[PDB]
Structures are given as C-alpha cells and as structure tokens.
Design a binder for this molecule. Sequence first.
Ligand code: V5R
Ligand code: MG
Lengths: 412, 412
Amino acid sequence: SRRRVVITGMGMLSPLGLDVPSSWEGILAGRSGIAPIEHMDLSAYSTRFGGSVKGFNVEEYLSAKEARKLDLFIQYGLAASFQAVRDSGLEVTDANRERIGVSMGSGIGGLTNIENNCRSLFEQGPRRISPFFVPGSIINMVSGFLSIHLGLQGPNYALTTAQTTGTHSIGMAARNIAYGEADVMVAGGSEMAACGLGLGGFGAARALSTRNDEPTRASRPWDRDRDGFVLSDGSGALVLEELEHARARGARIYAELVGFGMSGDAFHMTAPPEDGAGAARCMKNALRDAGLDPRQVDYINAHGTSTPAGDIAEIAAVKSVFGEHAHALSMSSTKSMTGHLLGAAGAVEAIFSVLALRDQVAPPTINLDNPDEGCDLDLVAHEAKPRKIDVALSNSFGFGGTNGTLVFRRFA
Amino acid sequence: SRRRVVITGMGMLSPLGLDVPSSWEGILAGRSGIAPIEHMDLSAYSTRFGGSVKGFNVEEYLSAKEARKLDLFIQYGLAASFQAVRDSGLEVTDANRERIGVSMGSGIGGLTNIENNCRSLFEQGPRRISPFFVPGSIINMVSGFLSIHLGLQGPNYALTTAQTTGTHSIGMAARNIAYGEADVMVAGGSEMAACGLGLGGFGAARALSTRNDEPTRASRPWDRDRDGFVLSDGSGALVLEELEHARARGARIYAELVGFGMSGDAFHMTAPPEDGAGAARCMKNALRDAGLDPRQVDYINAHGTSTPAGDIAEIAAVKSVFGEHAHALSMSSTKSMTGHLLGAAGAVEAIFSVLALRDQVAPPTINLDNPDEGCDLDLVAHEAKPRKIDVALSNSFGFGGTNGTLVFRRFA
Ligand SMILES: CC(=O)Nc1ccc(Cl)c(C(=O)O)c1
Ligand SMILES: [Mg+2]
C-alpha cells in the first residue's frame, strides 16, 4: 500500500545547456553538444572530443572558497540539485527538514581531483596533498554538501552503479517516499570524467568513438557505422515528492513516477549479452512495479550508447518485452546529441522522459543515417516526432551487468 | 506487510584475520591488528602504521589472471562475499537466481589502482593506462563481479556513504527483502585506502593518530590521550534472507535484523556536532523501526573512531536516547583492535554485533586506560564481558553528516 510519487522540480548541466530549458531546446532541435575538448591537451589521444559543460559559473551557486574544496563532479551535482530545489518552490522548515533527503550519485567520481593531487604527491611528496582532498573528492559529498547547505535531515546517501547510477538514484529515492521514509528527495547524478585517466582509461579499452574529423556525427546509436560511445560531463537532479504533500502546498507537478525496475545480467564485467536478457528482465520488473501492460508504453528513452553490442542488445530486449507492440512505441537515444554522461546519463534522460510527456514529443535519434541489421523499430531518426505519450520508460545498463528502468506517466 | 529478515551467513577480511572465526577470536582476546605498514615507504608521512590484511591469498577465490585486473578493495569484497555465501549454505539455481541480489559498497573505492594508473599516465603516457582501469577501479564492481561468479540476477547496486557505507548497505539490502524486491541479499562493504593519497589525504586533515612508536596503543576510543583514528583495510559481507525462505531450506539463523535508521546531521562536511544530535535522531529512528523500548538494548557496537570530537559526541547521543538506561547497557568500540575500516567498518562491526548475540559477550574496548571527562558508561574497558544480550545496536557516522544504525535481535 505504497504512496504515489511525483516530480515537482528538475535541474541540469549538460553538453546542450546550463539548465533544463536550454538543454531541452537543443534536444528538440536535434543539436549536438559534442565538440573537440579545449580544457586539456589530447593531441596524442585516439579520441579528442566529447560533451563538455560550456561556460559553467560555479559562483552562481558557491563561494570561491567552497568551490576550491570540491571536485567538478560535485560542483555539477550541486548546481543541478540547487536548480531542482529552486524549480520545485519547496520551503525547508524545522517542521519538514527531517522528511527531506538526498541521493545524488556518480559512476566514477573525483578523477580530476585525484589527478591533481597525484601531481603534488609524485613531484613533492604527501605534505602538499590538500587537507580537503578526501571530503572534496568522495562520491557522497553532493548529498553531504546539499544537506548541510539546505538543512536537509532526511535519508542522506549516494549510489554508485557506473552508467546506471542516475536511474538507480531516482528509483531508490522514489521507494524512500513510497514507503514513508521521506516526503521529499533530491535525486540524480553527476559526472566529470574528461581528464587523461577518463579518456585514457576508456581509450585503452577501445570503448570510445574515434571519429575526430566529425565529432557531431560520432554518437550514432543503431547506425551501421557506429564505433563506440562519446564521453560527456554534466548532472541531473529531480525533486521527488509524495503526491498529497505536493498537492497540499500547490506544487506544479511535471509527471508521476509509477515504476522502477532493477536486474543483474550476471554475464560479463563490461559487455551485455547479445539478446539483452537482463535488460528485458529489468523493463518487465519496472512494468510489473507500475501495474502496467507493456502495450501501455508509448516512448522509451533508450540507454543507446552507440556501442556495437549494446545498441543491438537493447533492440532485442525491447522486442522480447513488448512483442508486436515494439512496432507501435517510439524509442530514441538522446545520447546521439548529448553523448554518454555515465553516472549522470540516467538523471538527464529521466528529465528528457518527463519533458517528452509534458510536450507530447519523442526526441530524435540524430545521425541514424543507415540503421543496422535488426534495428527496424521506430527509432525517431533525425527529427523530433510529436505523438501521444501517456507512459515513458527510461533505461540505463552499466558495467557489472547492473540494469535500471524508470517508468513515468502523465499526471492529471 | 513487511517481511522479517535474518542473517544466515557472514564473511570477513580484517587486520585480525582472513575470515570471521579468526577475526572474532582476536576480538575476544583483546588483540590489536595494528602495525607499521610494510607495503609502501611512509618515511615522509606523519602516520606510518595502520590495520593491514595479512597474508591474503586471492587465489583461494579467483584466478591470478582475473585478480591482476582488480583493485584490492574489490578483491577484499569478493573474498568476504564468497565466504558469506559459502557460510549460508545457499544454492543458486534457475528457480531462485532472480531473487538473490548484492549490495557491496566502499567509501573511497579503488584509490590504489587510480594512483598507480595516474603514475603510469604522468611518467610514461596514456598508452600505459590499463584497459581494465575503469571496471577494475569503480565501486559497483564488487556487486558486479560477485553476480557474474555466482549467477545472482536480483537487485545489483552499491552505496558509497564514506564511513557509513557498510551500515547503509546492510540496512537498504534488508529493506529490499522486507518489501519483497528480493528474498536474499549479499550486503556489506570493503576498503583498501592505504596508499599515498589515502594516508596523505587523512594526514593533511590531521585526522589520523600519529602514535608511530606504539601503533597497538594508537586506537584508544574514549581514552583521554586519544589523538585521531587508525586507518585499516578489509571487508565484511552478510547473507540477508527472508525468514520463511531461510526456514524452508533449514538455514542456520545467526540473528534477526529488526531495525534500521538513517539521518543527516546537516552540520559539517567532516565534524560531528558535539551533542551527537544526528546520531541520536538515527538511533531513535532505528529503535522505532524495530518497535522497541530503548531499555531493551543490551549492547552497542559504537562507531568509536578514537577522534576527540567523535567519541564524546557518541556518549552524548547514547545518553540522550537511553537516559538512565545508558548506565545499564554495554557499549564498546572494536576499532580499538581493528582500527577504522572506513566504508567496511559498518560491515565488520555488524558481524561483531551478530557474534555478540550468538556468544552472549560484549567485545572489549582495549587501550581505555583513563576514560575522558563524561565518558562514564560501561565501555567494556580492556576485557570481553560475558553478559545477557537480546538486542545489539551497531552505529556508523560519516563525512557529509551521514548516519546509520542497525538493530539486531536474538532469533528463537
Ligand atoms: C541492452 C543492454 O543490456 N545494453 C548494455 C549493457 C551494458 C552496457 Cl555497458 C552497454 C553499453 O554501454 O553499450 C549496453
Ligand atoms: Mg590497537
């Protein structure tokens, strides 16, 4: 006998914009946020482009003193969190602060800060390591700093499930509210892995696109010429709220969160099984959680990373769960435009799924010039598609075979 | 309709032993696991000792080839997880594999591997980064690799809540089972932060004991001469199981998990409030969750890190929650012997709390020569104390003001 959970605020940094409306305008226009990386020298690397956050001004959110302590992934998570809480109009008081929590996560966390501190350590020894190195670099410090700044005393934790983090963070936060452990949660994820270790680590695994001549064409989910994912930075946050709580204060409700599914593939450390069996189990678990028939799904925001094996596994899983209904729904990958924000991917894609419901439009899969063998569903190639969307699903599948699915519905 | 949750298996690597029985024998004997660190040169560091895992043989669990790809924190978490599943006697089958999940977490994760790959990048170049850098370093890969090796297809995730990680991992895993999302979970935490960035980062904060001439006396919770925590390595895992599921297969039940609390302090990024208000809120949440009178608590395994501020905050929190009953319960810090396993602390201390119920004994606080002002409870100084224990609490507090409490009870 679970409580209902609605979305009352959203916030974001992405390669398409410094907030949700600017990002979404880009999504509906089919704009690429992918460009050559300017913030470090990648002349000797096989991939020299990605999705950067452009023109981020941390002093809109933090003092220079505060910002110097915190890794960029924490700055980005706090920017999205602050935006979402402002967007919600929630007032934190002594009467409600024990009922408001935070679960903001990251896949990889503080790589840039670890690189910088490794420079000090190797060239000078331990005495030059920052006294703020540990608290400024660990993944739970978005949740930590947001709770201290806003006086949030509810459940305070952080998920780290690689590329599934943002999806699991939102799902588990929704369960906190549904089961009475909180009335409000700020949830989502953040990532800034564009450093030598990030580009070099994924480069060494040969996982990245190397289309340096045309970065905007590199991310091409389900296209026959795809050659790996595009690495991107950013953050997404949602304010999740118990429905009667939202109604009592006259909150603007964007959508309802009706289902959350999880599964493990138990298959391989990085590759999905060819048939997407774990992804299928995860989507079926999310529909059973929501009490929905597969035929009720109108739109899927795919994981769709532009990897050879991953994109085909997702078609196979959708065909398995939805049967002939797979030919009626629309499915798109916004990673075609944003690239892969890793731990933040599921958070920004949850927001895109909520806005697909608000605006009754399926975002395009750009760059889908020549769909690959078996890639024969409605993948919204090239241009956004206005259509009826009552139910939207968002998928994330990550290293270790860890899967998450969120189901959103229009709220009346 | 919440289901009951019991503990049916446990596993561990600690500074006292390579499994649960050897570690617990050390605990009941008042043995220190703390020694000068041998695995690197710390002559330039202000702290040169800690709790290392001694004589670990990963080849008892994994191929040498597989182990070379994995940070030590992942090797340690897998070892504890394998032990716990073997200890439980559970058989993974097609009929139950979707109902068995894993939530193994870490505070800092793969710092040694990230440091070593950073050294390769800076001194040689990006082509020397390991192709296994990402999957061998990120925190979700204990859950990932355990699910691949055992065939576990249920909920697969990882928490990272700094020094609260193991406690939160066990509590949220118990909620998964209680609410019907799984029937079995393997849950706990692992840590190996003894690298330059670890010892140097905590050293730069002045958080560590610097008692280099007497490492076995350094960790001295509530003692007037304490001067900071002792950094330690290892892992703990529990098999959590729905009660009817355990009974149906004739499982040996160690104890029941009856309560779980979370709270945020919302106070400071690293320091606890002097009055322990967040810790008190957390313990009250956990006792109400368990439907208990506070007078039912017989034993508290304290966080008890040997910090000036933390240890006195915990006395204040216990006096606030328990009133006159604070003088009737026994409370001890096993960190007096193990040191602080950071994200694994809550997992190993949950195991010690369960063994205090099995053996009807309060583990000692060693080194408690001169209890500090106001530290006037039964802190089980020096020697283990046999006594009646029906209910045991385990507390963890961490950076970002994150708090967790587990309540365990004897099972008939
Ligand atoms: C459908 C499915 O299971 N896809 C999947 C799983 C895991 C990863 Cl890591 C990726 C990817 O990033 O391409 C794709
Ligand atoms: Mg000792």
